Amino acid sequence: LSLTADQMVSALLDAEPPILYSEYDPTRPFSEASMMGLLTNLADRELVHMINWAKRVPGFVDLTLHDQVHLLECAWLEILMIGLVWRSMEHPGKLLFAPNLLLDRNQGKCVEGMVEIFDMLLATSSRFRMMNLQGEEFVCLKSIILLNSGVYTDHIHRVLDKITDTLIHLMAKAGLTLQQQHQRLAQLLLILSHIRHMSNKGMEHLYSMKCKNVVPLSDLLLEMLDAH
Amino acid sequence: ALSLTADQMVSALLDAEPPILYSSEASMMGLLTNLADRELVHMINWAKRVPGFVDLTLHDQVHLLECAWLEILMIGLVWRSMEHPGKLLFAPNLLLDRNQGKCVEGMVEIFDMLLATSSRFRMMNLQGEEFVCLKSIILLNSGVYTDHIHRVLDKITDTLIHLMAKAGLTLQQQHQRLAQLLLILSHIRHMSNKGMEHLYSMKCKNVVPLSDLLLEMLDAHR
Amino acid sequence: AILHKLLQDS
Amino acid sequence: HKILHKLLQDS
Ligand SMILES: C[C@]12CC[C@@H]3c4ccc(O)cc4CC[C@H]3[C@@H]1CC[C@@H]2O
Ligand SMILES: C[C@]12CC[C@@H]3c4ccc(O)cc4CC[C@H]3[C@@H]1CC[C@@H]2O
Secondary structure, X not given: OOOOHHHHHHHHHXXXXXXXXXXXXXXXXXXXXXXXXXXXXXXHHHHHHHHXXXXXXXXXXXXXXXXXXXXXXXXXXXXXXXXXXXXXXXXXXXXXXXXXXXXXXXXXXXXOOOHHHHHHHHHHHHHHHHHOOOHHHHHHHHHHHHHHOOOOOOHHHHHHHHHHHHHHHHHHHOOOOHHHHHHHHHHHHHHHHHHHHHHHHHHHHHHHHHHOOOOOOOHHHHXXXXXX | OOOOOHHHHHHHHHHOOOOOOOOOHHHHHHHHHHHHHHHHHHHHHHHHOOOOHHHOOHHHHHHHHHHHHHHHHHHHHHHHHOOOOOEEEEEOOEEEEHHHHHHOOOHHHHHHHHHHHHHHHHHHOOOHHHHHHHHHHHHHHOOOOOOXXXXXXXXXXXXXXXXXXXXXXXXXXXXXXXXXXXXXXXXXXXXXXXXXXXXXXXXXXXXXXXXXXXXXXXXXXO | OHXXXXXXXX | OOHHHHHXXXX
């Protein structure tokens, strides 16, 4: 709560996880199983970084382990997805899962029911591009998702208020008028409703794959999925 | 629509509000889906009175309502239940406490989320004028990623901020409260998606008859 | 869909 | 306890 806006931004920028590579193997064609394998193997490795990133989000480590578990269980796929959409901004029509795994919508058809989710992710990437979403805004949004998504399941709300001040500060510093500031704040936060929707559909899809024995999921993923 | 003042926007949304309708596992689902079906007809009229909405093509109106209908039903339910801690006011003659959710498989989890949202509404002291703005935002936002709509959305944001300024909040307080209100829409989205999953499961299990309209709304979500 | 008609008749 | 519960500690 002590942190200034500039300190908050620096903290969040510093905590950013790396972009990981997939285990993509260009020697063989994709199958439904092999693509699901790549994507879930990637998610799994990302998760370990996500856990350590969360610990660096102001206020998170003050919570009980149970509360930390609950927030990450609620938000993990939302966080993976907003990360994906951010990575994919400078690649119209494609999703940059990894630098060696850049897929267009046609490749999503490889997995039953996946292309619908690709389409939503692509539309969100387009919206980010239309808004000219900045990196400093992105990290604020990602932290908001972590702290908000499972919060209704005061300390947390104070941090959330601090991130709001931070978003407004960034916008003011960028020269937006006062009216433009609350309008953009709203536009950015309404994106979070769409990210929630995609996460819910993505979770249903993943559950479907598991229940059809399409891909072996790690114990961690099984449990993250089971929390839903 | 883009011409209205903040006060005129509030007035229009207040005027447009739907009426409050009246109301075993099979009978409870029967009551709930019967209620929902009748509410849906009034929702369509309300939507037509949300400024900007009738400017849209028929195709786009249908799409927005198909996406948002359960979110809209739920935020209304949460609003009605605000002054009744621990209960959901589905209708004035169907006020259900938390444990009656157990009467239907998988329902109490959803009851719990709705109750938590109502609890959040209370702790924020959500106002009626704010509520109708939020319901309008849900209608226009939920399916919108699938420019004049974004201009109308900006106007409703303006209207929310106007209401907060009128209420005496500082600039800093306005921005913080705007954020708090909009973040609850993420929770309402979550609840609608869970509710849709539940309704689909009940349909498959033949536990209740559903109206042609409801079946249509449900199948819009695949 | 009935939705279409409701919108038109509203 | 959940595996996440463990990862939140080790490190
Ligand atoms: C969860 C899925 C696999 C993991 C995918 C992933 C994997 C890694 C990542 O960084 C982002 C995403 C978003 C989409 C996710 C997919 C949506 C459906 C699929 O089952
Ligand atoms: C859709 C369900 C029946 C209709 C319910 C309803 C019915 C009427 C209403 O005004 C609000 C709601 C919210 C919750 C809905 C339920 C959630 C699960 C259930 O299937």
